[model samples]
Target: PIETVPVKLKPGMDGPKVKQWPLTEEKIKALVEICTEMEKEGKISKIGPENPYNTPVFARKLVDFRELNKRTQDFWEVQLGIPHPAGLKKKKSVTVLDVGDAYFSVPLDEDFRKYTAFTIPGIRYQYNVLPQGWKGSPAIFQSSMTKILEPFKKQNPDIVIYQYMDDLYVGSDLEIGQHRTKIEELRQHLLRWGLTTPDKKHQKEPPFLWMGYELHPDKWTVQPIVLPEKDSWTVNDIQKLVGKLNWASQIYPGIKVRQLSKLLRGTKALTEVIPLTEEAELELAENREILKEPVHGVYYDPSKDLIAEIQKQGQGQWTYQIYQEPFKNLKTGKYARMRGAHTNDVKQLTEAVQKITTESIVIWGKTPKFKLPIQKETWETWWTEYWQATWIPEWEFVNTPPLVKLWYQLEKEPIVGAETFYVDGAANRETKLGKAGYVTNKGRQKVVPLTNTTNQKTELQAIYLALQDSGLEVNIVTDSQYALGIIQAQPDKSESELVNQIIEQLIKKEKVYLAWVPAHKGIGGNEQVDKLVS
Candidate 1:
């Protein structure tokens, strides 16, 4: 049932912030210590202060700011919980506002005539705060959200939080409690830190709009109450909600309703594939009452037209029912009418691919092979070689997939200074004691204990974090023997023992290298986890 995964930059392995760029946890802890010290010495007690303290004064006792960020993300996930979309459903809601990071922004109209003050008391975005680039934003978002929501997850723990940049969604539990108290609590906490809420319209009734869809007591939906007029269609919005639902159809097979997203907007279908569902049949036979309205101005006998066409064609024609449409609109007699379906599909698929950054594609051979990343020019090589990869679960990111077979693409070496890849282990039983893994400009660096898999899949889940932080060409040395093995042993479905067979076909554009080393031991790059444990 994992619909949307919050994306995050890979976290790093050492320093105040194991990750290189941003302020690290140790660094932030140093600030906390200095703030405490200033109060002891009667310098300053509150947050508003100049950057007067130098590194020498606080360097020794400072905690990693990056770790603090990871910690704060953890608290938001565990202690303070929100849902996929925080404001999504107000019933049974919880809100979280952070001390750092903006809680509100001001949005201005293009003509400056209409202005909206963008204010949200407690919210988080869907992706991580990346430094330069990223390898896995989706997995990081999911893993971080899960960790934060774990500690205080109650019998009716009804909220979650995913922080990416600034945009966020507040979801609710259709089970109990309205969000009035939750809003008040969030406002109170946010005010303590200096933030505010948006003055947007609010609805409090059944079938009310959440992040977008109606908040019915049962049968959760993801329809937006209103559609924007600026663009013909927003492929991103559709994918985030209904499209996201469609992507996870395996968990809820009925989510094939993704094909029905156009109907979610309360617009009359230009055409509808009416399966003789009992609900539809009874409604049709019993002189059922129906509402009619036009969304995007396509008001016509879409249902009737489709039904008539199908009746003319015969029953059990669901596939054609969903897709059978003339190039020209039957009523409008225009070109724009039917063109959007295919266009939007391609658009959505493209956006989905853009959203997905990395994954493994196996190409096993003892002999050496050229590696190419799918970032830019490398795809040409793949296309030239007639490269195509197959993936399971039946869903793919819009445009990109791993197009190369080189296993070492993840640990591409740095062209500049000596680089290092610090990989932590997602909790697993076998490598539980072998916790830390590290890699550098050379090869296999170190390892760490992978005790519990708060994140799903495998050590790649954690390695994805490493990739996010380190520079693109930094050599990553990890203790993920299993991850190494997966690439090494690209077991095809026929020869595979696993039910979920995987084979990512990516061109290795970058010079990534992989080497297996011991975990937590002071061998290779063992000191990589020195900061991880402490």
Candidate 2:
């Protein structure tokens, strides 16, 4: 609910209400008017980049109140709904008071006000009120507003005033008429302190849509929205498809991740129709079962109940948690049942995990309680012993004696032969046919084929090739995170033959640095190397 209130709502209602103020032309113009007003009030100003500031900046930590909420950091496009505490009644009316240029509302502290002083090439100025760009602005505003509202809160301890930076959600246990009367006194209190809201109040009640997730009280479990397109899948396209499944997998348990991963593995280079293995077909059939999960009025929605159960089992030991919503399969319209457990109490968690015997149980999210198994000493021990159960591959320590000698010679002589490299990869059907020879500072370039291509594999092999010609310290640059990840894998136990070889070569060096660069940007070496992809 916000200013120019949209709809009405009653306390203790059985269902949720949604009323987003559509940004129509008139509303858009109204927004424009405020920006103009801020300009007239001199709240914002344009300045040249050659501006100088004399005041020394100090230790300042500040953020927008919306930015302050941890909830904002979760997946932005999809929102997990928020539930009210048990037995709590809803608010009948919510007043959303918006402060004008909120950062400018609070006066800066005298000691720090000078810190806001700055000079442009053609102008000089200092802020009387808290400045928008100042590092301490949000922190100062929060502290000041808290001080200003302390008395009101102390006097009316039962009243709930949810301050969200520039916006305030004023709510209460009282009904509309009572709440209207009760809220007026606080409104009056704010005016005396020069804290007046713009012309916005839910005189009656408000329909609420929270955090993008539709909340339906009628259903025991609320349904969440889900959406997509595309055709003959490229590796990139399949990766994107897998991305959606990955997101859904977090919410639901028992989606065949291992099998799904297998299907995508070699398809990076395959252009023909994918021939499915029996195992792959079984995985696809298993995905059909995901649809059983209820979308609306979800009861015993495996994910929802799992959180409640984990907390119940956790008793007081579990301090906090994040739980994902259960997802329904798009094809079969079924839900995956809960198959994993999480609890702060180790013993209780162990018992629950033992009971959930599904073949494809999925665990989701991180919590402090889950970190018990990964203690530094504990993990290092497990890493060495468990992987050592198989043969422990000796570090290959590749032909780095040349690079080693370069470093050794550098100690006595100033000159050392060191070069930098950049790598990239791409694939296309025609490019399955190919050409290329060498690298030179004199820049000879041509469109060459990047064949048998997986971006990660190609880029990693480039690094492997680079190491063979590198000196004391090669500055390897690339845009692929996957390549760097494998290069950094432990030497003793690697994920694949490629990683094993890369680690073997990498471990021989002490000073090799991997740098990441944004793609499509013009870098001399990066551009030349990327020609192989075309």
Candidate 3:
């Protein structure tokens, strides 16, 4: 199972530094040998890094915090982090415990040891303790720890327990002595796997639990981590502060996890501080206020409360913007203006539409009388849908899925100029070369001799010349059907490759149109090109 474990991302780092393997051979051997023993002891079973599916370790890379925020659940049994849970009364007594070396505490499964093995000097070594810097390491560690705490939770069902990654908070309405006793019991539970919480790191001399945020009995307040003077902070500092708030956002549900996500969107370097602008300073202050008052955006479970009725109902109501699109039946060449039932509830409506479509005939909706070839085929074979959702969040600086940075530098670009250009290509019957030229805003662009005399090449040259960098919305007047046909067709490597120089501008949301015109027309642009070609 471990042998074929997939490598989804690039692994390791550049060169080696010191004993790159963070553990010794004796430790590695002990770690491997104890896997079965731990299972026998029932401290851990089918757990840890070696269980390839359980923990996936990957090389260090820029963390995409947006994804991490989404992966977290909104409703928590305890309000230790973010969104305040509805009907959660104050706990009179609470003990928050911070686990030390949490990631390094869990042991690796024997099967995965060799995969993590590293060589330095004369010795080959692997981590006996689960190593950090893995994609799924935190998840795996939490899973194991959850197993350890399962019994405690079951035993003390009344105690509000909140575990955000490694920080564990135990809260109760019970007296302080009783609460601490429960905490002790929980500590023993962790010890079953030799997992020890370092004493120094525990809540020391606390009135209650202040896990770095504003956590009161009934609510979680906003307290972003302190930062360097706004002007003094570098990109790295901002990132660090943003990351700190991100964790808080994780625990505190409903806060836009990406509130600060937009600020660092286009930035690349963290070195050399870029002083904060007045607007940025104001943004930081605004963020602080948003966090400070939990009531402002505190997310509460709507299931218990009647608020956010639409979300709780799960049956979504959709509003449609109707469009008439051309549809055709492949078998009969029957075409109709399909009254496209474009709706916001796309996924729900799409699956609903599937019920009406079957092996007999797949459908979107009732169209001009048409019948698809009765065969077992997928939706793509018989029907097509073209639509865009209004709710999708657009990412301007992201390279990840869903949110992509635009490929063209179209934003804020000045419109160089706009002109409807005309082009023509001419050649003799036994042609060694041909001529192609286009009329632009200034005058007739002189014809450039070419080796090819085909009408297709002439048409392509005309379109190409009209597509040159004018930057503004431009139109092309062409007489050739071949060029227009190729342009309108589905992506073809041969055609698209030749069209790249000008295609990006069109896709970048610029206005570009191609229209057919009569040859030898008296139109100024067309007439000029015709005379040049002649």
Q: Specify the highest-lDDT model's number.
A: 3
| Clash count list over all predictions | 87, 12, 6
Best by TM-score: 3
Model 3 TM: 0.37
C-alpha TM-scores of all predictions: 0.21, 0.33, 0.37
Ranking by lDDT: 3, 2, 1
Per-residue alpha-carbon lDDT of candidate 1 for residues 5-104, written as tens digits (9 for 90 to 100)? 3322225421121212233466656655544553353322232112111111123332112222332222133222222221222335433332232311
> Which ten residues in a row are the worst by lDDT in model 3?
305-314
lDDT, candidate 2, 469-512, per-residue tens: 56657667677777665443323324466655665666566457
RMSD of 3: 17.9
- Who is ahead in lDDT, 1 or 3? 3
- lDDT value, candidate 2, whole model: 0.42
lDDT of each: 0.32, 0.42, 0.47
User: What TM-score does structure 2 among the candidates reach?
Assistant: 0.33
Residue-by-residue lDDT tens digits, candidate 3, 1-534? 111122122233221212222344555455434544533544333323332211211121121222222232232233233422222335677667877767657665554444444332133344454555444456567766776777779989979777767778777788788887888777777766566677866663443344554445434444454545544776656777777766655434333434444556663443445655555665566656555543212222223211110010122322111112221111111111211321122233333223222211221222222121112222232133222322211111212222111222222232346565777777777867777778776663656778845766776776776666344576676777777655543121132344553454445436556667777667666777877877
